[PDB]
Amino acid sequence: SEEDCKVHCVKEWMAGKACKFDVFKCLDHCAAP
Amino acid sequence: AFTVTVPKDLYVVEYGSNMTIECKFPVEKQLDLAALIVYWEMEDKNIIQFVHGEEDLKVQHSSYRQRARLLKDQLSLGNAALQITDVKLQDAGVYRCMISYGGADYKRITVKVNAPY
Numbered sequence: 001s002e003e004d005c006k007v008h009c010v011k012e013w014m015a016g017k018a019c020k021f022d023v024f025k026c027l028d029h030c031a032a033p
Numbered sequence: 034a035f036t037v038t039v040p041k042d043l044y045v046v047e048y049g050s051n052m053t054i055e056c057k058f059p060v061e062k063q064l065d066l067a068a069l070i071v072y073w074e075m076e077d078k079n080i081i082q083f084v085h086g087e088e089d090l091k092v093q094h095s096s097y098r099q100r101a102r103l104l105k106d107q108l109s110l111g112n113a114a115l116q117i118t119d120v121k122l123q124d125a126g127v128y129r130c131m132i133s134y135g136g137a138d139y140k141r142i143t144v145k146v147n148a149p150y
């Protein structure tokens with residue numbers, strides 16, 4: 001579930017690169033309780 | 034779980050020298066470029082964006098031009114090594130390496146620039 005949240009952060013970071021999304025904040029929040 | 038690890042979380046580097054800052058990720062047998070993303074960043078400056086083997090110089094931050102590269106020989110061994118040549122005082126700060134290879138993770142590395150005398 002945590003692994004999937006993190007993969008999705010990368011997905012959205014990539015999507016942004018096509019189309020200011022902070023991938024580190026996103027990854028942080030996947031680990032955040 | 035997919036984890037990125039740093040052999041060093043602090044590098045103290047001489048002004049005008051060359052530094053290689055390392056970020057490790059698990060590789061089973063041979064590296065697959067089609068599945069790999071490496072992103073090196075420093076306080077919102079984009080240094081390396083390696084997407085499935087593809088790098089675009091146009092999106093490297095102007096402060097790193099002709100000074101920063103991802104070392105490809107290390108990459109084969111699960112080592113995303115960022116080499117910066119002619120280290121500037123402005124190179125001091127917090128670097129982040131994000132690796133996506135199956136899973137995803139990132140680490141912070143502190144670089145301090147000294148001027149020995």
Ligand SMILES: *[C@@H]1O[C@H](CO)[C@@H](O)[C@H](O)[C@H]1NC(C)=O
Binds near residue numbers: 049119
């Ligand atoms: C850094 O790299 C350059 C070649 O890219 C080399 O000539 C130089 O000696 C290196 N600098 C130091 C201070 O070792």
Ligand code: NA
Binds near residue numbers: 047149
């Ligand atoms: Na020195």
